[PDB]
Design a protein around this ligand. Structure first.
Ligand code: HEM
Ligand SMILES: *[C@@H]1O[C@H](CO)[C@@H](O)[C@H](O)[C@H]1NC(C)=O
Ligand SMILES: [C-]#N
Ligand SMILES: [Ca+2]
Ligand SMILES: [Ca+2]
Ligand SMILES: [Ca+2]
Ligand SMILES: [Ca+2]
Ligand SMILES: [Zn+2]
Ligand SMILES: [Zn+2]
Lengths: 213, 142, 219, 222, 219
């Protein structure tokens, strides 16, 4: 009686709770951040296959009403896109202390010809008056063990991050024209492609796929 | 470093790479300006005549371009000391009477030295640029 | 009232939850998986191109059969797979009268205008039952110009057609010698809501402006 | 404060209780998962089909069952012709009238046990629909052109291929094939799609004249 | 709830206690008994000296056997007790690349600088498998000089070796005629974290500055 009816009440209430949370789960699955990211990555591949929508040194604001904006004006704290896109990219993928480990794709110019390269972020300096191009101090760590010897290296280097190009530029520390450039997918930020390029010939002679460790 | 014959040549070549292609030139100019005004926002009052309150206004665009043109004459004549002295005297006259603290010139320098490597993105020398800018700025001040 | 009161509190909780979910619906509508994939399919298919001639319509997506674009949505099955009469293909809503497509016009030829709003306003459609391959569209082209310190509307009446096969709306100015440029829109974004347009010269199809309209629609 | 730590003490071990409950739930769910699983819908469909076939029907030659709750038999010539002849309309059902078993490119293969005609040991046979035509004025049949081919060893290199023509009948669920026009009456094929789907069939390779069974294969759509 | 509530209070007490102990861990880490004793052993052993020749390595602590320092950590047991291949002896972490040793340089010769920070930054190591007796080190030497009212970094690239037997890192300036003095560090404090260094002239080993680096390490 006064317990059977109460129990039936509690039961119906539990079932309602279940149906409600089910709706919530549909909502969550639809807006799942990871899914949206993957979508962005796919869209990005397509964009890579298409003709550039903007002049060589500009930035596509995107949206249903496209617009091109100078690369030097992205993430400077002043809205230049009509949709403010230039001022919402502004999350630096690199934080002081981050490690990225890159595995070799091809390579025919690096000194040690290593299997993997660890890029360690040591510090970040952001000029308040020029926030669109943060400066990083990073170390390029390599460990190659051949027959004749075992070599370990940790090359301190200076870098710049471009929010405009979603791109890390690591200036060479040794006496070769060899710089590291990490291109970000635009949406991932846990993985970039690290191409090694001769600062001069612009020749692309090595590539590593870096992942956030 | 100091403004050698050689490092002047280096600065001259790099300035060619940065300025000579009138595409993003007004944007280059305006970037320099946003940086400057970000450092020393009190300096905007000196530019009332030319709409310093809105760096996207056509009047201020015209301004920043006039500036970069003057600076271009200065850089272009680093290897022609007579002409350089002439242009520097001219700029000095255009600037005398205006109460401009060294402060503001340091702001300008810092702005230029941050926008430049963003423009070139590659092979550039901040020490040479520092030296030669110092020479030009000293010329404009007196 | 034992724990009946507690259960009541639970019920208030559930009410609150439901309210919140209903609120989430607005944000949920901003995500269109199927539409996103249809867009990507469109764009990729554009990068791929086709093996068909101009004025031809390729049947499936992978399919090898070509058809004259004079046979597309004419009421007769011409593709081995009937794609030329498919519902997605034959959708008439890009030019449903009442539609107001708005976008920003970016000029780089002909005229020396700064970036500005343009509206394509569909005013009417005729579709002959003896020739359904095309819809004859009449529309008004409006432009908000901030020419001389103050704002001013520049509008003109225009006429043309929507062709199903290439998903293209062509509007040339009705008896408007008055230097009003034609407009050509491609509904190439996978839907009937967005289009990639150009302001062009009618005779030469030279592109004087880039314009991207979306439906938005309601003045 | 102290009251804050009491409140926090209550919060802390309600979350702990929730965690325990979650762990226990996972135990029970894991215990439930080890009770086997549900069944493949194909296995059930095929089982039901086999039972149905063993049950048979009270239909006459040139009749086929309508199927459904109240058994009714109607003519071969009345299935899928646009008029409902079954009391329940099943002779015009979209599944019954699936034209998939006669689709161009459809091929059904399986290993053949021979009983005559061919003295080879069990190998595959494949029959492939190469063309079809369904006349709009006579829809209860789909006329098909097919090809019967045999799997032969790497050493044979002189494969045998038989060109066939015939029809698919919806009510019979039957693909019936005989020799193409002027092509030596060697083989015919009778496939019965009685597994409950458009994807499996019981085939016989027969003599076109006598319908004498030369061999049997269990056909599967590949 | 009898005294169950009391027990609950006790439990809150224990939680509080645990928090406090966990806090004490930081202060507890500032005390390294084993390391302290290792340091004292080092310093005392330095005061004692050895009976071995220069370029020789004494085996145990009390032990009388001497060995050539070309045989130390070469992969072969040369001491009667195998000390020349012991793990403490052969530890390669004083020159693990990435290490940044910092200290104050006190000048009393050669240069007229006031006391100032110097960093030895290990940039790389090579250890031939055919000659493990020594590690070839490449490093960057940085100095923060407050020379003329404002601060200025004075850095140079350098190269040398770490020798296990005497625990010594020698770094001479790579092609730096430009009056950059060499640096010699002795990891004589019982660990791989602190070193007693000198700025010296390479040719004569004359000591121009006293420098004591510790690892600290992270810019
Ligand atoms: C070496 C860097 C600089 C160069 C090359 C430069 C050059 C110029 C030039 C070409 C003009 C145009 C004058 C005319 O054509 O009438 C000008 C005007 C002016 N400059 Fe500079 N300048 C520099 C730095 C600065 C500094 C740091 C300030 C202090 C914020 C400053 C304040 C002004 C002002 C207030 C004007 C006039 C604005 C107006 O037209 O109302 N300049 N300068
Ligand atoms: C680099 O590669 C080697 C094998 O070639 C592996 O043993 C090592 O762990 C890798 N390091 C990282 C961080 O991936
Ligand atoms: C400068 N003005
Ligand atoms: Ca901006
Ligand atoms: Ca058609
Ligand atoms: Ca019928
Ligand atoms: Ca040894
Ligand atoms: Zn963007
Ligand atoms: Zn460093």
């Amino acid at each position: 009686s006064h317990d059977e009816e109460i129990d039936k009440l509690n039961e119906d209430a539990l079932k309602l709770t279940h149906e409600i949370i089910e709706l919530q789960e549909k909502l969550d699955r639809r807006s799942d951040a990871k899914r949206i990211q993957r979508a962005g990555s796919l869209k990005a591949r397509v964009e890579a296959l298409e003709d550039p929508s903007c002049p060589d040194h500009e930035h596509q604001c995107g949206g249903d009403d496209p617009q091109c904006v100078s690369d030097l004006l992205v993430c400077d704290g002043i809205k230049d896109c009509r949709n403010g896109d230039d001022e919402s990219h502004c999350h630096n993928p690199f934080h002081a202390g981050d490690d990225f480990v890159g595995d070799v794709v091809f390579d025919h110019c690096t000194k040690r010809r290593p299997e993997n390269i660890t890029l360690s972020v040591e510090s970040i300096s952001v000029a308040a008056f020029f926030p669109g191009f943060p400066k990083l101090h990073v170390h390029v760590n390599i460990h190659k063990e051949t027959d004749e010897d075992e070599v370990e290296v940790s090359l301190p280097s200076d870098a710049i991050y471009s929010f405009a190009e979603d791109k890390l530029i690591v200036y060479p520390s040794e006496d070769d024209g060899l710089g590291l450039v990490g291109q970000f997918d635009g949406y991932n930020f846990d993985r970039f492609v690290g191409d090694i390029i001769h600062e001069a010939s612009k020749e692309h002679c090595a590539r590593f796929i870096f992942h956030r460790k | 470093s100091e403004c050698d014959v050689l490092t002047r040549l280096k600065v001259k070549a790099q300035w060619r790479r940065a300025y000579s292609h009138g595409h993003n030139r007004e944007d280059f100019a305006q970037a320099i300006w946003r940086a400057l005004f970000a450092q020393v926002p009190d300096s905007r009052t000196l530019f009332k005549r030319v709409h310093g309150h809105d760096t996207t206004s056509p009047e201020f665009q015209a301004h920043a371009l006039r500036v970069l043109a003057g600076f271009d004459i200065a850089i272009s004549t680093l290897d022609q000391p007579d002409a350089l002295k002439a242009e520097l005297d001219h700029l000095e006259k255009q600037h005398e009477g205006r109460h401009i603290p060294d402060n503001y010139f340091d702001a300008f320098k810092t702005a230029l030295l941050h926008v430049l490597p963003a423009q070139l993105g590659r092979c550039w020398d901040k020490d040479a640029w520092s030296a030669c800018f110092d020479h030009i700025a000293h010329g404009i001040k007196g | 009232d034992p724990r009946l009161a507690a259960n009541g509190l639970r019920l208030i909780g559930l009410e609150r939850k439901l309210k919140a979910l209903k609120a989430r619906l607005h944000e949920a509508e901003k995500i269109d998986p199927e539409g996103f994939i249809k867009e990507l399919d469109a764009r990729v298919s554009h990068v791929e191109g086709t093996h068909c001639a101009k004025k031809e319509f390729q049947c499936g997506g992978y399919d090898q059969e070509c058809i004259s674009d004079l046979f597309v949505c004419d009421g007769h099955k011409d593709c081995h797979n009937g794609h030329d009469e498919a519902e997605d293909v034959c959708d008439t809503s890009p030019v449903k009268p009442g539609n107001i497509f708005s976008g920003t016009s970016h000029w780089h030829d002909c005229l020396l205008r700064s970036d500005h709003v343009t509206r394509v306003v569909i005013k009417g459609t005729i579709r002959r039952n003896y020739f359904k391959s095309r819809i004859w569209v009449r529309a008004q082209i409006e432009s908000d110009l901030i020419h001389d310190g103050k704002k001013e509307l520049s509008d003109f009446d225009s006429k043309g057609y929507y062709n199903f096969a290439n998903r293209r709306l062509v509007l040339i100015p009705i008896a408007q010698d008055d230097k009003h440029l034609s407009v050509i829109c491609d509904f190439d974004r996978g839907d009937s809501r967005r289009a990639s347009c150009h302001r062009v010269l009618e005779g030469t199809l030279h592109q004087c402006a880039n314009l991207s309209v979306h439906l938005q629609g309601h003045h | 404060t102290y009251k804050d730590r009491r409140f926090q003490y209550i919060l802390t071990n309600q979350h702990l209780f929730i965690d325990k409950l979650e762990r226990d739930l996972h135990e029970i769910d894991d215990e439930f998962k080890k009770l086997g699983s549900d069944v493949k819908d194909q296995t059930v469909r095929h089982l039901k089909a086999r039972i149905s076939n063993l049950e048979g029907d009270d239909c006459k030659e040139h009749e086929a069952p309508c199927g459904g709750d109240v058994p009714q038999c109607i003519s071969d010539l009345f299935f899928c012709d646009g008029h409902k002849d079954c009391k329940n309309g099943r002779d015009e059902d979209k599944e019954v009238c699936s034209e998939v078993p006669a689709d161009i490119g459809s091929s059904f293969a399986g290993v053949v046990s021979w009983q005559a005609c061919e003295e080879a040991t069990p190998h595959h046979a494949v029959v492939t629909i190469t063309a079809n035509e369904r006349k709009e004025f006579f829809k209860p049949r789909i006329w098909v052109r097919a090809i019967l081919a045999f799997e032969e060893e790497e050493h044979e290199h002189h494969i045998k291929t038989f060109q066939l023509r015939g029809y698919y009948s919806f009510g019979d669920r039957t693909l019936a094939l005989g020799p193409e026009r002027g092509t030596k009456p060697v083989y015919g094929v009778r496939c019965h799609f009685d597994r409950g789907d458009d994807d499996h069939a019981d085939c016989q390779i027969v003599n076109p004249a006598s319908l004498f069974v030369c061999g049997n294969f269990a056909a599967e759509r590949h």
